[PDB]
């Protein structure tokens, strides 16, 4: 009954205003690109609209016609159609109204659930913040993966890169990072809350549905936006989705809040851009990618800044995901994005199958911030762990004397310590406890195949009996002398009793 009534409520308010608008006739439509004739005052990369309510962007301004890319399906545009200029550069809704909503590349709700109540709009193609607004990266972005929080730490405002082959565990790292922020977002202080944005480019709708249901299960859509430009979405949408998500995150950083955006992948935005550019007839380049393929990404990843306290203090981290071919990191787009970003996280299939998951190749993975953007406890412990693994990797290819035998033992113990499961990120203090137990020669007595057991068991013990110690480590943010003595006695007692 009231269903029809709320249906009427929609008619009750319409768009009576018909205006005198500039137009153009579609000389030629084919392959997703229209060649409009007219639109004399249409701007560059403006948003135009077609007679069927379908949008497009005027990308080419040639003397005789305007090359327009259609944001949607192309079968509905005929020749001699009508294109009306909307007089507005391409822009997307922004605000907290988008949190928990799945939206398409243009900010249209995609999961039903009504419309977006956004009260503001932001242009996708905005220039990056200057040199003066920024400030060096200070806080840590807690990822939950032990091997990332310890060996390749990520700060807030950094631009890490997750690069690997197909099916090595990149989206898994992204989802673990998203899920971990629940503990901070549930708390009270607003200086730790991190709103997450996930841009899904070229992924089939089933994958994004699995991902969204996984976030819902972990109750992580309270603060997540999902911008999906899946495979069946015209190339002009997969091209533009990263920029839409980056605007949704620029809104957060511009208002003193913190945001995390995860492009997934950028190697598919590159392909969509190449298709667009080849269908506008622009000359190809190397591997057929346009010449402006580096710019495409550099202008996009340069928006992940760390504003100083005069500009709000907000930040915007970025975790672009690249996909290499058989580990050929030396390809074109991989090298471009490698020389654009800060750190990197190399996932390798030889490590994925050898049992090391996440496959993070700690030997090659880097993080320019390194020291900074790491908690003092983690800084204390992960340093010694890093040295121990660095020494171990040198003498690992084989498998005598007591010193090097114990060095290999410690290396292997730490290696089996760094493993982890899926969608179970650990609090930083728990990581510190586990890594401390491992690196203070305690596990050297145990067999390596059993280490995982210990790990799990140990936490389930400390998480109940010694909540006070973990709270101490979190609050004070360091392993004080008394905290160290406690940790020592807890580990010594637990090891024997197990």
């Amino acid at each position: 009954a009231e269903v029809s009534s709320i249906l009427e409520e929609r008619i009750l308010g319409a768009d009576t205003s018909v205006d005198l608008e500039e137009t153009g006739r579609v000389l030629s439509i084919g392959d997703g690109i229209a060649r409009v004739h007219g639109l004399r005052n249409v701007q560059a990369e403006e948003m135009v609209e077609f007679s069927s309510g379908l949008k497009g962007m005027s990308l080419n301004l040639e003397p005789d016609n305007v090359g327009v890319v259609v944001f949607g399906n192309d079968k509905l545009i005929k020749e001699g159609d009508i294109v009306k200029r909307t007089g507005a550069i391409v822009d997307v809704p922004v605000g907290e109204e988008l949190l928990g909503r799945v939206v398409d590349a243009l900010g249209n709700a995609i999961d039903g659930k009504g419309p977006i109540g956004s009260k503001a709009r932001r242009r996708v193609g905005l220039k990056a913040p200057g040199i003066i607004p920024r400030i060096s990266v200070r806080e840590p972005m807690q990822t939950g993966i032990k091997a990332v929080d310890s060996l390749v730490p990520i700060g807030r405002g950094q631009r890490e890169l997750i690069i690997g082959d197909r099916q090595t565990g990149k989206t898994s790292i992204a989802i673990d990072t998203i899920i971990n922020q629940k503990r901070f977002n549930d708390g009270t202080d607003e200086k730790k809350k991190l709103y997450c944005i996930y841009v899904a480019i070229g992924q089939k709708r089933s994958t994004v549905a699995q991902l969204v249901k996984r976030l819902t299960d972990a109750d992580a859509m309270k603060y997540t936006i999902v911008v999906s430009a899946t495979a069946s979405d015209a190339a002009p949408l997969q091209y533009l989705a990263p920029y839409s998500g980056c605007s949704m995150g620029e809104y957060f950083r511009d208002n003193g809040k913190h945001a995390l955006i995860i492009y997934d992948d950028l190697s598919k935005q590159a392909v969509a851009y190449r298709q667009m550019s080849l269908l506008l007839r622009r000359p190809p380049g190397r591997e057929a990618y346009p010449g402006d393929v580096f710019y495409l990404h550099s202008r996009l990843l340069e928006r992940a800044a760390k504003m100083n306290d005069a500009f709000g203090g907000g930040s915007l981290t970025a975790l672009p995901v690249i996909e290499t071919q058989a580990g050929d990191v030396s390809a074109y787009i991989p090298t471009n994005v490698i020389s654009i970003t800060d750190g990197q996280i190399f996932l390798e299939t030889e490590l994925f199958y050898k049992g090391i998951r996440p496959a993070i190749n700690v030997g090659l993975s880097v993080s320019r911030v390194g020291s900074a953007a790491q908690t003092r406890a983690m800084k204390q412990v992960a340093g010694t762990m890093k040295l121990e693994l660095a020494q171990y990797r040198e003498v690992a290819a084989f498998a005598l004397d007591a010193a090097t035998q114990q060095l290999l033992s410690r290396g292997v113990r730490l290696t089996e310590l760094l493993k982890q499961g899926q969608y179970s990120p650990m609090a930083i203090e728990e990581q510190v406890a586990v890594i401390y137990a491992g690196v203070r020669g305690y596990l050297d007595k145990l067999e390596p195949s059993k280490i995982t057991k210990f790990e799990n068991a140990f936490l389930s013990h400390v998480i109940s009996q010694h909540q006070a110690l973990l709270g101490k480590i979190r609050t004070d943010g360091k392993i004080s002398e008394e905290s160290d003595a406690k940790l020592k006695e807890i580990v010594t007692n637990f090891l024997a009793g197990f």
Partner: protein, 62 residues
């Protein structure tokens, strides 16, 4: 506002639909066939329990 003849025309066809909805008008067999299809799908996905009152458990001690 009393001028948009299409506006009031849509509102009028609305009012007629409101009054005539004693049973889904112009339903056709597709109406019932669908209704049945997704009702059965939802029933299968949810469960087969006593879909009326609270079924009882009667557990077993350790």
């Amino acid at each position: 506002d009393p001028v948009q003849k299409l506006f009031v025309d849509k509102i009028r066809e609305y009012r007629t639909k409101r009054q005539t909805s004693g049973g889904p008008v112009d339903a056709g067999p597709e109406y019932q066939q669908d209704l049945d299809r997704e009702l059965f799908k939802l029933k299968q996905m949810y469960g087969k329990a006593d879909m009326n009152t609270f079924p009882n458990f009667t557990f077993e001690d350790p």
